[PDB]
Symmetry: D2
Subunit: 282 residues, 4 copies
């Protein structure tokens, strides 16, 4: 099952694609719907025609329906340095110490209103000279830490403020439009092996491929279930929480984002998340 | 006005004390009520007798009413190193670089369900050997960053995990019972000078004053309005957000919290916030 | 307990008077509150001062509080010809046949929005030349038919349309402002004997006692519990239904109501319900 | 447009048939949806397949969907003696006086919870020996009295209690299961001439046509818009009110309903409303 959501005259409607490319309109709340599928694979709703999923992906809007965030995630948490490869602890950089330590990095990324979806604008902080997208695999979680599905997430990071001091990390990570995900949430059975997926980042400036990069999830050192385990320890998370698993694609110092740019992120079996860039006014 | 809230048979009731020690039961939501007072000092409700504010402070519960968090803060943000006085940037420690830099530290502290109030238990992470309370002045904010009132907050911090690596800071700061505040929210006109208040920390173990410390807010280097300014920049905050302003009282390596302890925090004009300690099971 | 309700800035607040003239503000819905008292006589709320019940009765409004209907009755049912003393069945008038028959009269009187309260205007139909108030004792009922309390009701009746044909009875009885009740609902234990109460009707025109009449409930032939029994038979009634028990005070053909009139109805132990009259425009 | 509604796992879903036999699932509340069509004929929703309208009509339930009342009518009002052809006024029977008078009969029939729909059981009062169905054309109304659509209604009447005394009419007309309507609500443009429709009543006992009768609406003396006019005069009605227009098909004294019977009512362009009969236990 692949689940997406549209906004129509100020209200939401959630749809799901079954393997045979038939579209079902959901009776239930999308998060609630994912928990059900996670148990017995039952889907409650009616089969619809006239919903052009393929056009929605390309054109975002058709008539009076517009695609958006597939769900409203109550909490979004991140996890950095999970692939194989200035502030320093006794000679070693903080990043490489965490790479080797038992305890992974876990941080609070976003609230639902700080997130955007397919075809909506991510933002660059008014006071950042160097902001990069971080293309990551992300998981949707229930309150016990059970994986309800997968999606593409863009962990938008004001890399310059982070470099200045690791104590500025929250300011670098949490802001309006700091996070984008979609275009769907694929159920768990739609991905046989999560550690064998291709993630591709493209930044597009005035029709020009300004950056192109790729990495496969088989290069992920720190496994997903360990990230989950450390996230939920003594820490209650609501149903529909998203944990974003980290990035391997890191553009250079010169590849910093700016106004009008287009960030396209592709992951096998999920699709391509396209977000325009809007630079904040001081 | 001094505003508190009780839980009675599974529902909340909000009350407010006017200077002449008369208690008013509120018609409005407490956050909504604070926004009103912030404009024209109007309070909507009826005068009540039989509500023993003074007993509630000492005994927490009377008959079927129990005092709790005065409001449900949609977001709680912290701000460290704001008073005058290992990871390091070119010789200098990360903490002292932020002490001198233009940009203050701002971090996401808690969601409302991760907070507790007067007479409820703060927690120590199951995997922390050294956790300290951080006694701080805290402000209640509207969406524009206007100060709606003041309160006492305990920024409960797993100091050992933080010391190990600054990237563990979120794990050290965000968990169930990681934050406590109360016992009231005092309106802005109840504090003529916020930079002239006495904050006192006491940890009590088996009847014993295990730690006692004090500092006055006139020692606050980084001012409050600057913390607000940096918090809201490109970052939308909901009505009733609490920003906690930082601590000067830091117990030693040997004064780490444990099960059954009592943390009492006193600030002039606000009162005394008392929270028992509960140590988490692995 | 004597329970009343005010409207304050577009919202309701319910209060209750305990025998010792102390006023309690209710935590619960008034209908829900009556069901509780009906079981164990428990009242949930806080004691208030500054609510001037006695002024409210006389002046209707004080500052920003105005007295109104004590509850929103989901259904209002009437019962005619219950005291001892043209359409006709085999010589006898329909009214006198029902007087003698086993089966009492039961009719649907009003929906909640067709009702008004103490100090609000009852109406006369635009097409009625002869409308009279019918001063009656009324009972508040739970879904099983248990008496939750008593009140005063004015069954406002377009007597001329009724006289023309008994099939016009619904049109004579159901309209905007066709019904008024209050000023309180007295709990069941506040009336030792319901069949020993004085009901008094006064119509007041330009300061003038235009009509004065009285009757005692000891003259009630058809008992209340029989009316209840016939009302609920095969007929589900919601909690807080009001059944009005019938009238003995009937003004003459010349005493028909008109614009600006004042209808005052008094019953022992309950009080005096005052409603101005407004004549409808064609 | 022809609009119906199902109950599925404790919740409602509303569908509409467009002339070309395509089924649309509604985004809006059905009453709200009818008001929209009444203005500009716009319908908000998605085209569905797999909803077998024709099976629903015949079998009531398929899988986990069951057809029911097409809407929840806030108020149901009746109107008797509207076709061309003991209590008496000066020699003439009350019924024939109303037949000739300017003022039609209007009565309150039911609340929504006293109504049932296609395939659900109408009831006979436990104390009625002679109850008949009254097959009528019914209109759905907005608050101004504008006709939003048409439906079939069964005005179930305890004819014996009515005959005994016209003051028992409410008891004869208002009870649990006293009213049934459906199976759809047809929009106004689906009926070119409301005064040219065939209404057919069949009572079925153990496979046997126990009664069969028919009449055409061209025999309706008292017109519909006059009934509306008299209904709303000084009397506010909510959106989605149903007014039932009266019957011409009256079975004999021997054709009284009983347990297990099947009442089938057919009207041109609307369909056939089928309701089993359940006799009440004393």
């Amino acid at each position: 099952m692949k689940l997406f959501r549209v906004v129509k005259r100020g209200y939401y409607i959630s749809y799901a694609i079954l393997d045979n490319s038939t579209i079902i309109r959901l009776d239930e709340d999308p998060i609630k719907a994912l928990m059900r599928y996670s148990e017995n694979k039952e889907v409650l709703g009616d089969r619809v025609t006239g919903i052009d999923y393929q056009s929605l992906l390309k054109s975002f809007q058709i008539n009076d329906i517009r695609i958006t965030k597939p769900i409203d995630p109550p909490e979004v948490w991140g996890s950095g340095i999970s692939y194989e490869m200035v502030a320093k602890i006794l000679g070693k950089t903080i990043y490489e110490k965490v790479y080797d330590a038992v305890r992974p990095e876990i941080f609070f990324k976003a609230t639902p209103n700080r997130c955007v979806g397919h075809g909506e604008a991510i933002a660059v902080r008014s006071d950042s000279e160097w902001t990069l997208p971080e293309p990551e695999l992300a998981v949707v979680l229930d309150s016990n830490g059970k994986i309800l599905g997968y999606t593409i997430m863009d962990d938008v990071s004001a890399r310059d403020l982070e470099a200045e001091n690791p104590l500025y990390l929250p300011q670098s990570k949490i802001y309006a439009g700091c996070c984008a995900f979609g275009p769907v949430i694929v159920t768990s059975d739609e991905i046989k092996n999560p550690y064998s997926l291709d993630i591709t980042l493209k930044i597009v400036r005035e029709g020009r491929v300004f950056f192109e990069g790729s990495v496969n999830t088989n290069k992920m050192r720190r496994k997903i279930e360990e990230q989950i385990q450390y996230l939920i320890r003594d820490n209650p998370i609501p149903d529909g929480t998203i944990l974003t698993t980290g990035t391997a694609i890191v553009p250079g110092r010169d590849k910093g984002l700016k106004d009008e740019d287009i960030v396209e992120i592709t992951i096998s079996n999920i699709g391509t998340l396209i977000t325009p860039v809007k630079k904040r006014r001081k």
